[PDB]
């Protein structure tokens, strides 16, 4: 173990990956939410190109 | 969220017509014919049912507290 890397939401290594509408609703996650942002200390952070 | 009780412009009750409108649209009425059948003559009441978005159905998918 060398460290922790923040995970982009709905990426291939996110827990929401491949989940369906029913699963996302059970998890209290909006299916319309695109992801593509990070969660750091509870806040949502978006990297600007 | 949910159909308004009153049309904002004139004040006609459109809160009891959403289910009937959905049923008519399911019964292969077009929007214009369904609105005419429900008795919404002028465009101010027609826009209510024509442009409504029912988000309450989406809100009811999430499991509730208690």
């Amino acid at each position: 173990f060398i460290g922790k890397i923040p995970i982009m939401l709905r990426s291939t290594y996110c827990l929401l990956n491949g989940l369906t509408d029913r699963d996302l609703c059970e998890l209290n996650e909006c299916p319309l939410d695109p992801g593509g942002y990070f969660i750091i200390n509870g806040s949502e952070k978006v990297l600007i190109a | 969220m949910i159909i308004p009780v009153r049309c904002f412009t004139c004040g006609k009750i459109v809160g009891n017509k959403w289910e009937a409108y959905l049923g008519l649209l399911q019964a292969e009425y077009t929007e214009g014919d369904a609105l005419d059948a429900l008795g919404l003559k002028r465009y101010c009441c027609r826009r209510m049912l024509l442009a409504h978005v029912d988000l309450i159905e989406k809100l009811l998918n999430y499991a509730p507290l208690e």
């Binding site: 982009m8 709905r10 990426s11 291939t12 290594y13 695109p34 992801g35 593509g36 942002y37 190109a49 | -």
Partner: protein
């Protein structure tokens, strides 16, 4: 075989298909995944 001025239906069908496959944030997800 040519689309004979049905073009307004055709182009929006292909656009629908494109946005159904990819969506809007693919550059983010693809960049992070790679």
């Amino acid at each position: 075989e040519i689309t004979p001025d049905l073009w307004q239906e055709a182009c929006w069908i292909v656009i629908s298909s494109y946005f159904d496959e990819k969506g809007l944030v693919r550059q983010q997800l693809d960049s992070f995944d790679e």
